[model samples]
Target chain A: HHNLPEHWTDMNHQLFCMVQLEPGQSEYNTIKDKFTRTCSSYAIEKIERIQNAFLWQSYQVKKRQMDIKNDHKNNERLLFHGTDADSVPYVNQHGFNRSCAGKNAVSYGKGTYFAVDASYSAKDTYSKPDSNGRKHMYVVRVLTGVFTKGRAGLVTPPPKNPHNPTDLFDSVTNNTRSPKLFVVFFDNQAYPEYLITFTA
Target chain B: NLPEHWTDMQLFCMVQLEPGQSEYNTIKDKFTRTCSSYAIEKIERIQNAFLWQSYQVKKRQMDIKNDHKNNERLLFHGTDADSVPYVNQHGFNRSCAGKNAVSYGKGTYFAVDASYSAKDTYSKPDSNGRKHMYVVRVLTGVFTKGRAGLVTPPPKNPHNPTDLFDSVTNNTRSPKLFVVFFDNQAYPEYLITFTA
Candidate 1:
């Protein structure tokens, strides 16, 4: 049962639905195994299933806008990304915003970064801890269909073909070639699906 | 043209609570506290409700010092399934006034109790077997009694009056219902999705 005692939460005005995944739950196992296996240094504290309807609604619209049917090859992957606990709430409420992008970090391009290996984001550099000493990471659904190599100053990814500038590549990558880091210029191209709370 | 042109479609946040949590309990208690006892299948706390900062700026301008109070109250409003997305995307529109009954002055209505809107008369189930209602913040400053056919809020002549009443109600002493008629007078705060 999802039963939680009233005392567990402050009941403050939160902007997204967060369901803590229980053991043996299908999602719980998949995300947990992925996190621990990819990054052995950290242990799973909790993984909260994110259900942001408005964001989902926006993603569907973006799918059409991107002409994702043929362009993306229609593949969606469960990938990892990280931010501090303080910023994670806003990320869930609003889609990933680059305007809030800080002076920090490497650019696989100007787009937001996601990791194929959970270990990549498990670092303190990506997932900073909150005042409460808990760090947060996300298992996001990134559009990882077609991508090419990235370079600094590239705001969008490469075009589908040299002959076709109208059709753009879905994303960019640190390796172009695990197919490790991924970058997406469109906010709606990815969704923060599961939030993993942990202590490193 | 401007800074970052993040579209409004991706701006709003709706945080849903696991049925077993404390926040869920608070809403569950309030929903059934007055009338129509229905089980909540979903509760999405509509954070950053569309155009809220602007609405609150106007709300802040109208806060009056008096016995009746801070000029704002947490109220309930129920609607059809088709309008929930609009309520989340754009605050309740003035044209949505008379879906139920217009006797309360035909302006946008907000009831004092959650159970008041728990009934099917306001929140009827859709094909998905779901009914939705909203917890909205309304400015009810210096209200007067309301009746049928009143399109605009009555003028108060407050202290000679290009100024108008903030709200109107069926009961003057202690109101069970409030009717307002401004573009940004109220904004939704939470959305309760349930099955009747």
Candidate 2:
């Protein structure tokens, strides 16, 4: 009964009128009753929709802010590669040796799959006095994540960390926070190797 | 370069719920009133960057084959496993609590809460030449729970699971979040489609 689209078009109003027609009622009276019901329902629906829209919108903004904040705080980054490893599929990020290399285990045979860096940095909250006089060393960088097949690069930190494969068992997850820095490296083969940098 | 003529949508507002907080009863009511349950353009726009692209890839492919018009896509819901409020782990099997989540798979948006499952067995033809179909087989205690030790006057099942295969489309008549999966035949065929 209440599941009508928030957008009230003429069709919706007509449907409400039809629904109001009680059994054995005159067409005129039925139409009148429907008119009344339609008006009421429309008004209620409008209020509810607007109210909900406002609430949801606000919640969304706050959630986004929180996400960026958290990402800015993460100091660690995960590594991905684009190469085959001992029958185990993996990407050879930085040639298999570095703090930011090989985060997940893949099934397919790899040929230097790709490289990804997951790093987090604390968001700047204040100003400071610098050499000139009063200056703030502020760097505004958009925090961002990666996708496989289509393209891969550093994105905001994952909404939740996927470092622990056993506990965090999904191959793909949404990284909604700000990334420290995401760098998509290229290869001799155009669009081959990639690097995702999250600023720590 | 960026997609042509693409525009960024901004959603901003504020509501002091402290005053009207008393009116919300059920989780649905609370969600609806508090703005927690309503669907956002993107649950997390940042996270949706790639997922949306993937959806577009499939959707555009469909358009090329079929004479489709609109390109509007449904959004996915991510149940905040870490921060869901009002959740009782032992209560309703293992459904979500804080805010219901929607996900994208097989060219449509699907909502999966701790409450219901698919009812693919029940299906029928729809007025729209499309074979209407249900996705879940059994009663997914998503909305209304049976008379149980803890659950009281529960939420009603928007779609009846016990009844024979009926319409597999969303029941817009109900206020709860509605989702429908579309395919050609029955027997739990096709993919997940979302509505409001």
Candidate 3:
């Protein structure tokens, strides 16, 4: 029951450069005619990759600068939604729970596939264990950008570690129903050459 | 007045270019890029249409020098932006065609959607000389698609079927296609980057 934000503000996740690819030259004009529709989707995907990379990089730098043992999963500090540690019932006000006082409470208890802020009370008791009373839900974010160069390919989610939750986001949300947007940015003007070494 | 002129429902006169005028050439006088000398010649007609509204144009090489002293400073400092101290030459041009019109070159530098954080690091020539190359900065602003469809932050939606002016609030409208016109509209304006 880990609902995070006590304040329910609208958050923006960037969708990276997700261009709609026309399979052949004949479809060039068709794709061109629909550039924005293509670009908006592309931008969302790119931003998601960047979000993870940025988090990883910033965490490493901060740890080295402070000479503290690096803990990459410090996003709770990186993203606090403007709350202090001593705030009472820290989990209740910001966790996944339904409370009359919290106003915008998210229900969580059992059988939930995702996590949300649960607070109302620490009893962690509501309805049946497998009922809606104990379920947690997840909200997803996306981001994107343009590239000047480099090989174009699907960027795999980083390998999972017991301490890491990075790949969890991709595993749960990467549904195959709709066209998936790829995160692309030019490494230089445009990739005059593709530089990837694929397994032959 | 001139005998109540009426070509019922007639509006706008467009210009288009024919073949033989599409001959592409590479001129290294100022900078080097293969372009349609004929194409630009045809494009100039559109420029001339709005010429009266613009100021005099000058090449980037001429303006960047300003005078003798600055040119000397640039030459001595370094050949690229990283080597130089205070100044760096703009590889892209922002040309206009009239007196008091700030001088640059003939390219679209303003609308590039990518990086400014890294843009400054790109290289520049320290010694291209004040007038070492063929220099002619032409009228750029005069060749716009007109005021009706222009917007600061262009719309983001390309599938919009509403009013064309709906671009303002629709906020998602994509840029539309345009045809160039000369004396005839058949030759039409050449494709501008083919929308992509």
Candidate 4:
């Protein structure tokens, strides 16, 4: 757990733009006005990137849905068995055992000449690991503009040495399965610091 | 309102271009061929929009012949001076002091309430001597089947057959598609068309 503040407190982080204010001397009206404008600009920028990410995510969802619909159509023909056994030719006992060996397979052949087949093709794309073996997860990078550019600041979990998590937030959460809400802070700077909660 | 036939890229270019620059002529041709001359004519709409809202300030050059008097300074602090009355209780005094404190004669400045963040402002000059100030507002419909990108943040289960599918062919309570509009707190009126 991290030690986070509640409100009306000032915490200084080595950020790009600096605004110095003396407590009591600087009117909250002026300070808050500057602070709010600066922070609001920052928030707008960060939100824009998140919005772009959302658009890209929407595109990905649309593309994947199209692929699923196509794949289902592809498999539907294979799954269907003709009504007349003589016309379709039922799978031989050997072909049946061979088809049973594969995950998504079916067999149809004469007595001795038997073959098993499956119509599963790995779609090359980014995805998260799933128990159902369905590759549905995707990753997107939240650019640096969200952190330093905004009036408020953001902090995430410690970086694991292999990747320098600078100017980026990598999220693998799928918007299609479980939705998520992100709680960020504009915590540092001179004026009163506060939280910015968003769902991305 | 934008012209009915303009492409998204053309609209983007119109919003981005400034007048008087050499690039403007070429960009006009590119967009004209890419879209249509009629659509390209709408560039003036944006140009007129800028002329109405923007204020240009030119810096006064120093003259050694007159005397080596200290020249006034110009700074682009990116805030609108009029909106934030508290910044300098008196507008003239505040602007004058800022001019004296910095060293340039004059440059465009915004009121603190102007909400001129780096994301919004730019330097686009036309033959009419109009400077650049950028802002955009868009209105779009909610999504259902074909038009999904219009949905702001997008929903969790986009493929789920819940609401629309339920009314046509009942399965389960239709999964609600969620979206939101973010208003710039500094200039809420900038995004005033659709108020919360």
lDDT against the true structure, per candidate, is 0.71, 0.23, 0.19, 0.21
lDDT of 1 at B72: 87
lDDT of each residue in B1-196, candidate 3, tens digit only: 1112212221122233343443122111111132213112221111221111111111122222232222110000002323221111111111111111121221122211111111222223224311111122221211223222232212233453111211021111331212111111011111111000
| Model 4 lDDT per residue over B104-190, tens place | 222112221112222123222234433322122111122222222221222335563111110010111341111111111011111
- Weakest lDDT window of 10 consecutive positions for candidate 3 chain A: A189-198
Error of 3 at B62 (Å): 35
What tens digits encode model 2's per-residue C-alpha lDDT throughout B1-196? 1233223432211111222334212323322333432321111112122222222333443343234544232221222222111111111111122222332111122332312322221112233322221122111112221121211112134253211111121233442232222111111111222113
Lowest-scoring 10 consecutive residues by lDDT in candidate 4 chain B? Answer: B187-196
TM-score of 3: 0.15
Task: Identify the runs in model 2 with alpha carbons over 4 angstroms from their true place.
Answer: A1-200, B1-44, B47-49, B71-78, B83-168, B172-196
Error of 3 at A74 (Å): 36
Worst 10 residues of 2 chain A by lDDT: A42-51
Per-residue CA lDDT of model 4 for A1-200, tens digit only, reads: 01222322332531111122344453334433432342332221110001111122222332333234333322100110101121111121001111111232111111011101110111211111233332211111111111111111122311224353321221111121432211111111001121111111
Q: Which is the winner by TM-score between candidate 2 and candidate 4?
A: 2
**Tens digit of per-residue lDDT, candidate 3, span A108-127:** 21111111111211112321
> Using alpha carbons, what is the TM-score of model 4?
0.16
List the candidate 4 regions with Cα displacement exceeding 4 Å. A1-129, A136-200, B1-44, B47-130, B140-196
The TM-score-based order of candidates, best leading, equals 1, 2, 4, 3
